[PDB]
């Protein structure tokens with residue numbers, strides 16, 4: 001059951017206007033901020049629920065404030081009935097944009113530019129000590145205004161985990177960690193119930209980029225989590241290089257070499273995007289596929 005409904009006023013300030021996420025998005029709304037006269041996003045969870053994650057989402061949103069590709073933090077609260085967080089409202093998500101492409105694929109030019117922006121947001125969340133752990137196309141959205149619509153934003157920190165300790169060292173991994181995320185984009189390490197690391201967010205990015213260009217992943221029709229994991233464990237991921245620019249062999253070899261204890265060479269991964277964009281003559285001003 002939903003805890004709020006359209007029309008509710010939160011803290012005598014945010015008027016809930018429209019439900020924009022249910023299911024795996026949780027309970028999230030477009031609300032009217034009466035202070036600034038603008039639409040914002042407002043996400044709520046029951047305060048009597050056993051696993052409550054908004055406290056951590058607020059912490060991550062606050063720790064990311066001032067980074068590119070993150071929604072501006074607007075407010076939060078906690079009462080006896082629910083917890084909530086309020087943040088900048090964005091536009092259409094990438095799963096929606098791809099499915100609305102009718103051939104269900106993006107061009108290389110759109111894929112490279114989105115992938116570089118997503119890689120930036122991933123390095124950013126890691127840089128504040130958190131793993132996202134559910135990197136997937138519906139957790140990235142473009143802005144909704146002329147000044148933001150060419151920018152891609154990272155969404156939903158509900159499955160995040162802090163991977164650094166008080167000091168800032170990598171924290172010792174648990175021996176077993178229950179599967180986190182979405183089956184389709186999860187790395188083999190999530191399937192093996194290992195503690196996830198920075199490279200596992202990058203594996204999910206690699207799968208997203210492949211799906212952007214090809215339109216599907218090899219395990220698209222497989223729903224059982226164990227069957228999918230067995231496929232990924234045996235899969236020759238070099239088959240996925242066929243439709244990507246040549247330097248993605250470097251990207252795949254790099255992430256394949258990483259483990260929980262190895263910091264990714266983000267500069268190398270970035271150069272894969274930069275060099276590819278240059279080889280294909282992609283300019284930032286060029287239209288994205290949905291702008292055609």
Ligand SMILES: COc1cc2ncnc(Nc3cccc(O)c3)c2cc1OC
Nearest residue numbers: 020021025041088089090091155156157
């Ligand atoms: C227009 O549609 C959406 C617009 C959104 N705008 C901002 N945040 C979202 N989500 C978000 C951001 C940070 C943390 C979190 O838990 C959730 C959005 C989700 C949407 O659809 C679900």
